[PDB]
Curated annotation (Swiss-Prot):
Name of this chain's protein: Cathepsin K
Molecular function GO labels: collagen binding; cysteine-type endopeptidase activity; cysteine-type peptidase activity; fibronectin binding; proteoglycan binding; serine-type endopeptidase activity
The keyword Transferase is annotated on this UniProt entry: no
Record bears the keyword Disulfide bond: yes
Stretch of the intact protein here: 115 to 329 of 329
Organism of origin: Homo sapiens (Human)
Amino acid sequence: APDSIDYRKKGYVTPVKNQGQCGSCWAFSSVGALEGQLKKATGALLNLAPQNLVDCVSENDGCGGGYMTNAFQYVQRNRGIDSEDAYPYVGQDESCMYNPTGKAAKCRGYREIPEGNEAALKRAVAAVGPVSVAIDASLTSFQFYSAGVYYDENCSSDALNHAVLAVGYGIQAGNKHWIIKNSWGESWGNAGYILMARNKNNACGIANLASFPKM
Ligand SMILES: *C(N)CNC(=O)[C@H](CC(C)C)N[C@@H](c1ccc(-c2ccc(S(N)(=O)=O)cc2)cc1)C(F)(F)F
């Protein structure tokens, strides 16, 4: 397994999106992982529809929140998910309006990373590509982030409240990190991205609820 990798340089990651005033972070984390798998399997990078997930996953709560595992299971049972063009993101809860003519990808299940194992999460990123992860993003230091490797001793490993995408890992000035793609727009952080502490006792619970789709 490599010491460092950035999937953005391989063309596996789509531009940073903005979820707006809707707790649909799980939907953006889900499509991000599916977009990476679609690019590996077909060679084409396309924007998938998070709105398709907020409106249709009955096991989730739409703009009220949800889980990535439930999103993947829906895509599997539905035998598809729409592209962003075929099902536009509006940031609100609406009825399921899935269009089969706009289908851009599907998945055949998911696999979870062993709880709390950052080494297993590292091997998963190196071998499969972008992985959906859950973190504690409640702190003020997270909201106002800009440059450097993020670490805060007050970050909880048990209070998971946000979903993001791990697109790689590296080392910045002696500190090991995870390249994290957020869904709060380009005005946030470092052009929508955040470098989170790697191998610092599972900081912010980064390896507590990680998963990737199977194609
Ligand atoms: C992102 N913008 C908001 N955060 C979340 O959605 C987080 C995500 C990570 C994975 C922790 N999840 C929430 C959450 C999970 C589940 C529900 C929920 C689902 C389904 C129902 S229903 N429709 O059956 O009544 C109700 C609630 C809400 C939020 C949390 F709480 F952090 F675990």
